[model samples]
Target: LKCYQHGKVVTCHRDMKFCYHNAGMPFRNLKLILQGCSSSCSETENNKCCSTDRCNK
Candidate 1:
């Protein structure tokens, strides 16, 4: 699968079937956004996961 990270596209390992996106306030002026591929994923208020290529984008 594929995912997005730092505004770029990246290929993931075969075992990493899920793509994840996470958003949070890590600092006063910065809204942290994280996207990547994983073997396992969970969902919450500001986080999401998918099972398709580039799904995080």
Candidate 2:
């Protein structure tokens, strides 16, 4: 989990380190926003926007 605090990427790399800053939130949150959800928005959601479909028959 990468916690963003004082402009540092507090990356908790495997077998590396673990430290969180005060009032800091996870970089994962940004990632979730970028990704649009816990899972790929288009992939997990039964409905999606970025797809190939027509509006007529």
Candidate 3:
């Protein structure tokens, strides 16, 4: 699978079946958006996961 990582496209390892998007507060209270691949994933208010290529984009 594929996902977006800090605005760049990336491919995941074969073992990674899910793409995740996470939003968090960084230093200075700025919103940070992170996207990547995972073997397993869960959803929350500021986070999401999917099973398709580039799903985190």
Candidate 4:
């Protein structure tokens, strides 16, 4: 799963574990969004994962 903050793609992964950023800070409510990567997403040149689907493009 990938974590998103404020409608932005923050993390990308092949496994549903770990955080992209962790400061261990305390907050009353720092909202976050977790999105599951689509299997339809293709790989990047540097081996990172990214996607640009027809509608998305």
Candidate 5:
């Protein structure tokens, strides 16, 4: 996993724009707010990887 090297990140960053599920609580909300989002909505909203920076990113 993501927590490899005793928490050293292997492959993840803001630009990559997604917090792996194993990462932390910040990513948890990312998955929640967008969970079950319709495909059409995704298009309209311009869904991208769930980054921690944006309030809804």
Candidate 6:
């Protein structure tokens, strides 16, 4: 799987989240990151909708 952000494209060998998994996990790494993130990932902050931007409403 793959996704694009900030003009950068990230490709994963298996299913993964772009924000944290690819960019770098927030907890594990010195710098912070996100998990299960997408182009429309902001909705997740409110718990209304999250994951797979194009797959959801």
Write one digit per residue (lDDT tens) for candidate 6, span 1-57. 444444555553354433332334557547653433343335444443334432222
Give the CA lDDT, 0 to 100, for residue 8 in model 6.
58
Candidate 4 off by > 4 Å: 5-7, 24-57
lDDT leaderboard ranking:
1, 3, 6, 4, 5, 2
Taking the tens digit of each residue's C-alpha lDDT, what string does model 2 give over 1-57?
Answer: 343334443443454232321123467564222211121233444343221212000
What TM-score should be assigned to candidate 5?
A: 0.19
What's the residue-level lDDT of 41 in candidate 6?
34
Runs in model 6 lying further than 4 Å from the true structure = 17-57
Judged by TM-score, which candidate is best? 1
**Residue 51, candidate 5: C-alpha displacement in angstroms:** 1.9
Pairs of colliding residues, candidate 5: none
Q: lDDT of model 5 at residue 18?
A: 41
> What digit string (tens of lDDT, one per residue) describes model 1 on residues 1-57?
888877888898888887888888979999988678776764343248787778888
Error of 2 at 2 (Å): 0.9
Pull out the clashing pairs in model 6: 20-34
Model 1 TM-score (2 dp): 0.73
TM-score per candidate, chains pooled:
0.73, 0.20, 0.70, 0.21, 0.19, 0.25
For residues 1-57, write the lDDT of model 3, one tens digit per residue. Answer: 788777787889899888888777877769887678876764343248788888787
lDDT of 5 by residue, 1-57 (tens): 121223344444323444332222566455332221111224434543234422221
lDDT of predicted model 6: 0.39
Model 5, residue 13: C-alpha shift (Å): 5.5
The reply for model 5, stretches above 4 Å from the true place, is 1-6, 10-15, 22-50, 53-57
What shift in Å separates residue 26 of candidate 1 from its native position after superposition?
Answer: 3.4
Candidate 1 wrong stretches, greater than 4 Å? 43-47
Model 4 C-alpha lDDT versus the unseen true structure: 0.36
